[PDB]
């Protein structure tokens, strides 16, 4: 993470309107084990975190959860990428050089609803 990050310096206001945009610097150690869903092709029109697996790197960092949106990977904006494109960009920028990965994420806000109703 970086405190001095300003999303307005990287995005136009229309791209971040209503989003809580933060920068995460994740240290490259072990497997990322960060699953994605969505894509420009999908109903949600954005790349979001579908799961964070127990093993770590993403879970070990603590700052990334299911529902958070991936907006940028190592400075490249991925908001208009398909799921395959986002997946490829995330796998590439993890293996291909660098001791760390820079993720710009739109943190999903608190759920003001019961997201775990179990009745049938």
């Amino acid at each position: 993470y970086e405190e001095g990050f300003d999303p307005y310096s990287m995005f136009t206001p229309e791209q971040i309107m209503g989003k809580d945009v933060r920068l995460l610097r994740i240290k490259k150690e072990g497997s990322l084990d960060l699953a994605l869903e969505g894509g420009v092709d999908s109903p949600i029109g954005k790349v979001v975190v579908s799961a964070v697996y127990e093993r770590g790197a993403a879970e070990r960092h603590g700052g990334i959860v299911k529902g958070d949106e991936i907006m940028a990977i190592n400075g490249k904006i991925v908001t208009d990428y398909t799921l395959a494109e986002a997946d490829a960009a995330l796998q590439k920028a993890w293996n291909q050089g660098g001791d760390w990965i820079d993720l710009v994420v739109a943190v999903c806000p608190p759920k003001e609803y019961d997201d775990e109703l179990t009745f049938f």
Binding site: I44, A51, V52, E112, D114, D115, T118
Partner: protein, 479 residues
């Protein structure tokens, strides 16, 4: 001659894979067809040997068999399930390994003078026969192997399990924790506890080839239900209640859901198995009283108490009288402390409508009209009074919708016989109805649900549930 039970009237010489090994086993690079604590370096069968890359898995299977039987020359602590997963998982995926697994087990059961090892070997054969049969060529040898060893505790059950698995087809998942526990106890009979919505449970007899529908058939007879159409088994695991597929093998379903829960929400996870109504199609309260008093009332009551329906003060007083009667029968002293009980009688959105003593007085007056009713009659009266509501017999979801600016951010969704219902959480009014005839498509992710009729997009962790119910309702309505 698979169809026949063979007898000579006397004990026959113990059948081995010696003669079979001459034709179908590869050359030895102690007999290759008899017990050995030495790990295999190559697969037993000529078929498997002729295929490189299947060598490593065949050797890893033998090491896991040695470890399960206690023949591996160490004590580097292994949980049983990991060993059984190593023995059977890839064999289910690659059927060429299935005869290899049988031959490796039968080999370790041949001329094995170590009783503990031999006992464990029979547990492996018992688990194996419940998953897949030997091939046409191996079947008479495996059958004779068992037939000449009829006095072994698990031997007659192994013979029956081969007949069963040939009839119903193979399992998709390796042995479940429950199957392994029974095997390690040398017990062939298993009962799994099944929970019901009315806070009761039953022990249900299950075997390796039991399908979810077979358990349901046994439950309908046990509960004296007129039908179980639209009911199923469900697994309550982590903070989820997931339906089980009726046509799936019970032990396959348990593993598949547990695996799905592990990847979608990250040891063997604790769980409960419930039998409940899933689809609420043609539900006529009073038609099947056992179904109404065991299932229907107890599933509809908590949805009512959550305040999902639009109902008036007078509706709540009337239903609270019936609910009090259904729970307490003749005991009029349970409304003594109104804060300790009001949440069990009145929907949570309506409790503020009057004071504690006003609720107590109105409920008692209503309840007093049911003196001549039985508990069962009160439960049926409750259901008859609400069964025509458009939100009756529904699954509910609270979501954050992002497709309709005219609606509040958070909405309530009901999935039932009428299709998909969108409800205002404050007023309980029906915003709109998406009937099955108008729904053209739907999809889901782990964070969303989308529907096209005229589009609905929402944030939810329950898209998989919504998808499954829509599919289930659509499949049922078509023919």
């Amino acid at each position: 001659h698979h169809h026949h039970h063979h007898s000579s009237h006397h004990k026959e010489k113990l059948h081995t894979l010696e003669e079979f090994s001459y034709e179908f086993f590869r050359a030895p690079e102690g007999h290759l067809w008899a017990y050995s604590c030495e790990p295999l370096r190559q697969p037993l069968l000529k078929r498997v040997h002729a295929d490189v890359d299947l060598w490593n898995i065949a050797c890893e299977i033998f090491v896991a068999i040695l470890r399960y039987m206690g023949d591996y020359p160490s004590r580097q602590a292994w949980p049983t399930l990991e060993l059984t997963d190593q023995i059977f998982t890839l064999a289910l995926q690659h059927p060429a390994l299935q005869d290899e697994v049988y031959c490796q087990i039968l080999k370790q059961l041949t001329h094995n003078s170590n009783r503990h090892s031999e006992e464990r070997g029979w547990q492996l054969l018992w688990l194996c026969t419940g998953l897949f049969p030997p091939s046409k060529g191996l079947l008479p040898h495996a059958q004779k192997f068992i037939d000449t060893r009829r006095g072994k505790l698990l031997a007659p059950d192994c013979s029956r399990r081969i007949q069963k698995v040939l009839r119903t087809g193979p399992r998709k998942q390796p042995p479940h924790e429950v199957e392994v526990e029974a095997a390690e106890q040398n017990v062939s009979r298993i009962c799994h506890k099944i929970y019901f919505p009315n806070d009761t449970s039953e022990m249900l007899e299950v075997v390796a080839n039991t399908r979810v529908r077979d358990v349901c058939d046994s439950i309908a007879t046990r509960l004296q239900l007129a039908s179980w159409e639209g009911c199923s088994l469900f697994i309550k695991i982590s903070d989820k209640v997931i339906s089980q597929k009726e046509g799936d093998f019970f032990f396959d379903s348990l593993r598949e859901v547990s695996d799905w829960v592990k990847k979608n929400k990250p040891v063997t996870l604790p769980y409960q198995v419930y039998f409940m109504r899933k689809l609420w199609l043609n539900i006529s309260p009073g038609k099947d009283v056992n179904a109404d008093t065991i299932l229907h009332y107890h599933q509809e009551l908590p949805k009512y108490l959550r305040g999902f329906h639009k109902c008036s003060r007078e509706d709540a007083i009337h239903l609270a009288g019936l609910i009090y009667k259904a729970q307490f029968n003749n005991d009029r002293s349970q409304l003594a402390s109104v804060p300790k009980i009001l949440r069990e009688l009145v929907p949570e959105n309506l409790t503020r409508l009057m004071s504690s003593e006003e609720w107590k007085k109105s409920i008692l007056l209503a309840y007093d009209k049911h003196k001549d009713k039985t508990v069962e009659e009160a439960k049926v009266a409750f259901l008859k009074w609400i069964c025509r509501w458009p939100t009756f017999g529904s699954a509910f979801f609270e979501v954050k919708q992002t497709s309709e600016p005219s609606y509040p951010d958070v909405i309530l969704i009901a999935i039932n016989r009428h299709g998909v219902l969108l409800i205002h959480p404050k007023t309980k009014d029906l915003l709109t109805t998406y009937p099955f005839t108008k729904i053209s498509s739907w999809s889901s992710g782990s964070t969303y649900f989308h529907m096209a009729l005229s589009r609905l997009l929402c944030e939810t962790s329950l898209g998989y549930k919504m998808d499954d119910l829509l599919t289930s309702y659509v499949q049922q309505l078509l023919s």
